[PDB]
Design a protein around this ligand. Structure first.
Ligand SMILES: OC[C@H]1NC[C@H](O)[C@@H](O)[C@@H]1O
Ligand SMILES: OC[C@H]1NC[C@H](O)[C@@H](O)[C@@H]1O
Ligand SMILES: OC[C@H]1NC[C@H](O)[C@@H](O)[C@@H]1O
Ligand SMILES: [Mg+2]
Ligand SMILES: [Mg+2]
Ligand SMILES: [Mg+2]
Ligand SMILES: [Mg+2]
Ligand SMILES: [Mg+2]
Lengths: 781, 206, 206
């Protein structure tokens, strides 16, 4: 079996650079604490025992309440009077750092207003190994760069708003199957341990770890270790993962919490780099362990200071307010036990934190629309003589927008996936509503909405009469604790849900101006209908949150030119993407073994390696205008040569071999600062090209920079940079970026460092991973 | 919930059939999930120590309902003998070594359990457990010292014998005729018989 | 629709079993709803006069399918003998009086019908119609010269006899075994028999 070598001791904080002030304040606080009070910071209060999804113990003596940890990556879960933002995958589809940041800010503001200390997001794990992974939509993109960049922006947004963000899930939680034994047993499988993601050192560094490095460097306050094992060690007691990779090489200064009931070796987890147990025995065992010397004083002190450093880093001391909602009821009041009898208390204040956040949600909705096809179908005018609207995905959830627990259904329009990665819609504007509003406010043509996918006779009838037919289809997925229609979190296929393919075929047979709108958590197989000549336009709109209908029609009716690019590949078959999900235990009753044998070759890397032509390639997206690329130029910058990090840590302060060693430790050659050796971020090359709008309307282009690293085992191309740029008709701009040392390096397991290999590197600038309009060598120096 | 029952009501109603069970020589009792007068049944000393084991003089053993709440080791003192489905083990051991649970108490727990075992002749009639509650599968993997074994978990032992007869008989004996204005019995020579209601038909799921 | 069938195809395929029917002594034919070579079967002189009544020399009577289109009085000349479910009467009477339908035609229509009647011995075996197609009710009102009568419309005459036997036999005889790699027959001593599919079960509406 794959094996995870140990790494001890568990690194203590440096408190340098951007963490210096938080560290000082953290030390000042923790210096005042008893052992019991320190342990309290590290201990969850138990499942559903207080108000928040998780809470730490309090320190009443200093008037310090327990931390409130709340889902989700796309809003405030459970609470009332909040906003439902577009999912992370939509953010990926914008390719827009600014929008990612603003969404983070708005989310953080809503959490802040509710009294939340930690927002349990955003997500870079799963990254998106499998197209049918249940929780990919919570994250961003299978591409590590697109994810890492937008992850970083989201984090900065949240933390600038005064809330601690949480990078999750670390690491290798690339599917829902067998993530937890109890959950697998519930689905009729006979296993006693979670799946082991078997990932080699190079693959970790060059793919899955990369976006988390960006998270650390963005100053994220917390991390959440995953349910799964990595090389047969549970993430939350995997010393190689937490002590070496996260806290040494990436030099993470914040605190690590467990996922809820994630398996770890108890006290041993603390030694392996775990800082906080959620949802919370740990307390008394940890205390006992300190007193009897199995856990050093310096380790528990470091756990405490890591937690308080995060607290002070985002200014929780300034922005904390009482938790003014309850996760487990909408009731205004409730009972709580006292030392004697009970107290009747206010539990929900109904604090409206939505502000103007509907605007950014509508904007991100429109920016995440990806035009995949357009043979003269779009934009519409609103003066069409007869508009037909087809598909359940156009209509309402008959049980109300929030009628399904944790969105655990596919009722009506799909604007959000299911599970913990959710929030309650304050309302939901459906396509049906928005399209009807559009027509009745303009030309006032005929409009009918057939929103039962079984009502094919009526679809024929209406489509036959229509000037345009707008067809809505979806595909849903989510966290593994919810099973919808045989999809146990992960998708059992890449089919459109509820006979969506048949809806398209029926409508297209009767209308030669059929528009298809896909609300999908990820790719579906479209080979049978995308090339139908009666289908005049195709868009992917993803999971747009509360303003779905409005953000869509803004694009369909030409107020906004679509500028999104698909953040994943649309292939001809499931096989196009690679090997299936592991959905059958392969180690008897033991941990299923999930070998990441494809290495870095997921999504577009896989298609490129095997010379398979996607239907729609990664980074592809159309516009209502056209763009031209010209005049690539590479300037070498003559950066200082790379110096491997050296020297020692301080001795472990107070306020398995090596587990209790508080002596000075050697710095790893690829470590030395948050995000890795700072030499990795030296700018090696400046690369420029001119983008021109050669069409008749204003629009956004997403120019993309790819690199060929040039080795036999390297992808043909890997994304390294991108931007979203607005250009008026005839307007030109020079797009200028830099490549870092990291951008042109490979991980070398032997030397445990990033190396710039001898093979010639080529740089490309184009409009997609396949539309590489410009290229130039990166001259070595 | 706390069932609040006075002493007379217990004796004249709810306790009466359990007294019959004791006197019939029943080997075990199961204490309930609910509280009685704000003390969980499985750590209710009045219920277990006084009513059951003193007044009714029950000689067998008391198990908890599955995850029925009790004051941990305190429950053993209040008359609990067996904790199901299963901490208790290590706490009870420590309690004996501490002197917070007497030796004579744990000894009584064990002897009560074994007394039931012998009373019904388990020593003669015990055979290996030949089925599995959690799967109908014939085989399953099991963890060993080294790696795993694939073991037969279900032997499919047919124990039904002729029991269908008594089941038919009790069915017929348990029919209660509440009204009959010339309706019954039927002959089976009726010219047209109509049968109505889902309750006449099959479970379509098996 | 017009079924456009060439003379050879008619003779060697579709007509062949009908020839057998004629030779077997069938008393009546029913002409179809569709056209054949753009003439409705029930007024298709080639079909009825030539093929059926000349070549196959059918001696019985031809009735229309229920409301099958035909050229009215013209159908009689083209070989139709009976109009179902039933204007025709009036037009046919008028046609005979005015000479458009010869007396020998209506005579032939009548004699064909009565020949079929006598051929099978309806004179011997005829009993009153003792059921009603349109209701299962025993009694129903009927219009009289004066007011109405309440008459027996269903006598519930049980004609099933022992016909369940031949139905079971033909059932068994019509089972076609298309594949068998050691599956059948069964014994009835199988340890566990699974039955699957709605097609195994009852019509829940009766
Ligand atoms: O809801 C708490 C926790 N449950 C488990 C999920 O994996 C995680 O994402 C979530 O934050
Ligand atoms: O299944 C075991 C146990 N569960 C709880 C029930 O109350 C009890 O009757 C049953 O024996
Ligand atoms: O029901 C009378 C009549 N209806 C029309 C059918 O075609 C025919 O077979 C049937 O005998
Ligand atoms: Mg509560
Ligand atoms: Mg705001
Ligand atoms: Mg360090
Ligand atoms: Mg006694
Ligand atoms: Mg003749």
């Amino acid at each position: 079996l794959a094996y995870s070598p140990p790494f001890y001791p568990s690194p203590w904080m440096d408190g340098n650079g951007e963490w210096a002030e938080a560290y000082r304040r953290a030390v000042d606080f923790v210096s005042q604490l008893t052992l019991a009070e320190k342990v309290n910071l590290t201990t969850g209060v138990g499942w559903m025992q207080e108000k928040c999804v998780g809470e730490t113990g309090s320190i009443p003596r200093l008037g310090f309440r327990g931390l409130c940890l709340q889902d989700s990556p796309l809003g405030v879960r459970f609470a009332d009077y909040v906003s439902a933002f577009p999912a992370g995958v939509n953010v990926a589809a914008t390719w827009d750092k600014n929008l990612a940041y603003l969404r983070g800010k708005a989310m953080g503001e809503e959490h802040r207003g509710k009294g939340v200390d930690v927002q349990l997001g955003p997500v870079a794990g799963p990254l998106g190994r499998h197209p049918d992974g249940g929780r990919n939509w919570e994250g961003f993109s299978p591409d590590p760069v697109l994810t890492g960049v937008l992850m970083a922006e989201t984090i900065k947004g949240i933390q600038d708003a005064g809330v601690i963000a949480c990078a999750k899930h670390f690491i290798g939680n690339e599917m829902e199957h067998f993530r937890q034994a109890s959950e697998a047993v519930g689905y009729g499988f006979d296993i006693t341990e979670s799946v082991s993601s078997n990932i080699d050192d190079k693959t970790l560094h060059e793919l899955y770890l990369w976006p988390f490095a960006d998270a650390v460097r963005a100053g994220v306050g917390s991390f959440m270790c995953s349910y799964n094992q990595v090389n047969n060690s549970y993430s939350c007691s995997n010393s190689y993962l937490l002590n070496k990779l996260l806290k040494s090489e990436l030099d993470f200064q914040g605190f690590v919490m467990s996922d809820w009931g994630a398996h770890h070796s108890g006290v041993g987890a603390a030694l392996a780099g775990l800082d906080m147990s959620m949802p919370g025995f740990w307390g008394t065992n940890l205390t006992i362990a300190v007193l009897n010397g199995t856990v050093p004083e310096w380790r528990v002190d470091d756990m405490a200071v890591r937690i308080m450093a995060a607290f002070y880093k985002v200014g929780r001391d300034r922005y904390q307010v009482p938790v003014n909602f309850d996760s487990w009821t909408k009731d205004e009041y409730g009972y709580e036990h006292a030392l004697v009898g009970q107290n009747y208390v206010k539990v929900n204040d109904k604090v409206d934190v939505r502000a103007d956040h509907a605007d950014i949600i509508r904007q991100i909705g429109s920016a995440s629309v990806v035009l995949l096809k357009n043979d003269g179908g779009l934009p519409l005018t609103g003066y069409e003589k007869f508009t037909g609207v087809f598909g359940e995905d156009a209509g309402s959830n008959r049980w109300g927008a929030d009628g399904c627990s944790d969105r655990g259904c596919d009722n009506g329009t799909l604007a959000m996936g299911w599970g913990s990665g959710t929030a309650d819609f304050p309302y939901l504007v459906t396509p049906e509503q928005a399209i009807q509003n559009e027509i009745l406010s303009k030309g006032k043509g005929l409009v009918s909405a057939v929103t039962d996918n079984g009502a094919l006779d009526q679809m024929e009838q209406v489509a036959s009469q229509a000037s345009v037919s707008i067809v809505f289809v979806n595909a849903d997925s989510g966290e593994g604790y919810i099973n919808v229609d045989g999809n146990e979190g992960d998708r059992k296929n890449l089919t459109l849900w509820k006979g969506g393919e048949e809806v398209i075929k029926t409508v297209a047979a009767n209308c030669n101006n059929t528009i298809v709108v896909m609300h999908t958590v990820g790719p579906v197989l479209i080979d049978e209908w995308y090339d139908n000549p009666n289908v005049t336009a195709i868009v992917w709109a993803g999971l747009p949150g509360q303003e779905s209908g409005n953000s869509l029609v803004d694009v369909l009716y030409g107020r906004v030119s679509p500028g999104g690019k698909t953040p994943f590949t649309w292939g001809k078959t499931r096989e196009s993407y690679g090997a299936p999900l592991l959905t059958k235990p392969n180690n008897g009753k033991g941990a299923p073994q999930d070998d990441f044998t494809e290495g870095v070759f997921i999504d577009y890397r896989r298609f490129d390696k095997y010379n398979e032509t996607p239907i729609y390639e990664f980074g592809f997206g159309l516009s209502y205008t056209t763009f031209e690329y010209s005049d690539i130029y590479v300037q070498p910058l003559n950066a200082r040569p790379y110096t491997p990090a050296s020297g020692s840590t301080k001795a472990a302060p107070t306020f398995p071999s090596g587990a209790t060693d508080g002596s000075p430790q050697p710095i790893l050659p690829a470590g030395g600062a948050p995000g890795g050796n700072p030499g990795l971020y030296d700018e090696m090359y400046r690369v420029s090209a001119i983008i021109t709008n050669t069409g008749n309307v204003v629009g956004d282009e997403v120019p993309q920079l790819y690199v060929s690293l040039g080795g036999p085992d390297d992808p043909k191309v890997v994304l390294r940079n991108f931007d979203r740029i607005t250009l008026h008709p005839g307007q030109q701009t020079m797009w200028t970026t830099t490549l870092t040392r990291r951008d042109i390096s490979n991980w070398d397991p032997a030397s445990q460092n990033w190396v710039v290999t001898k093979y010639p590197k080529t740089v490309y600038i184009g409009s997609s991973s396949r539309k590489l309009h410009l290229q130039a060598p990166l001259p070595p120096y």
